[PDB]
């Protein structure tokens, strides 16, 4: 048909359960490549011994369920979809 990329949006997210980790083989681990950029050191607290900073953070991973072929989708490469509509890693900071 011809609604274009909207089709894609359906096709991927139709039965997609965002609770299960996106791997066809459960034994296969999902690798998250991360990136940290220091924007500013906001404040150091010498008394309470606590540092407050601002970071630009980048997360890259592989969603094995959200894969498709560019063809028969009008040669679409990438698609912008809501963050909270897909599985997301729970990476945090210990400090």
């Amino acid at each position, epitope marked *: 048909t011809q609604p274009a990329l909207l089709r894609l949006s359906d096709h991927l997210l139709a039965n997609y359960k965002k609770g299960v980790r996106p791997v066809r083989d459960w034994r296969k681990p999902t690798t998250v*490549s991360i990136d940290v950029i220091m924007y500013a050191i906001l404040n150091v607290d010498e008394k309470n011994q606590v540092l407050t900073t601002y970071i630009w953070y980048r997360q*890259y991973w*592989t969603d094995e369920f959200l894969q498709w072929t560019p063809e028969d989708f009008d040669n679409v*490469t*990438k698609l912008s979809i809501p963050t909270d509509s897909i599985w997301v890693p729970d990476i945090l900071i210990n400090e």
Partner: nanobody
Framework: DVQLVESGGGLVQPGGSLRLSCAYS????????MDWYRQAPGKERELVAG????????????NYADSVKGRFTISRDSAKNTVYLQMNSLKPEDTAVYYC?????????????WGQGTQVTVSS
């Protein structure tokens, strides 16, 4: 894995002009640097032109070899996903196979990618 496709190569008389196009494609990639290479029969690989964004994150910065210093002009179109090489006053010594080398970063990591290259023959 980003794929590169060269095009525009052909036969031209000396002193003529020819425009080469290199089209990149893939899934998730970031072209950090794009170089043009040429290889004459028997001769080594020669660096022709390159392009990379400046320290200021707006205007680009080109890099030319002493050989093609004045004749060649490398440009790009992010919208058309294609990097161009404008060859003016082609010499018979400029005759070679022109590849394009893209230093790109993917989910796998930072790596170099090469195209199939196009034949550029300058003869009378």
């Amino acid at each position: 894995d980003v794929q590169l496709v060269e095009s525009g190569g052909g036969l031209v008389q000396p002193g003529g002009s020819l425009r080469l196009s290199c089209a990149y494609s893939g899934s998730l990639f970031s072209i950090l640097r794009m170089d043009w290479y040429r290889q004459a029969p028997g001769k080594e690989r020669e660096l022709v032109a390159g392009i990379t964004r400046d320290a200021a994150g707006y205007a680009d910065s080109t890099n030319y070899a002493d050989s093609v210093k004045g004749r060649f002009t490398i440009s790009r179109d992010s919208a058309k996903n294609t990097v161009y090489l404008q060859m003016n006053s082609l010499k018979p010594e400029d005759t070679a196979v022109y590849y394009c080398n893209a230093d790109a970063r993917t989910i796998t990591g930072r790596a170099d990618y090469w195209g199939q290259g196009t034949q550029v023959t300058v003869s009378s």
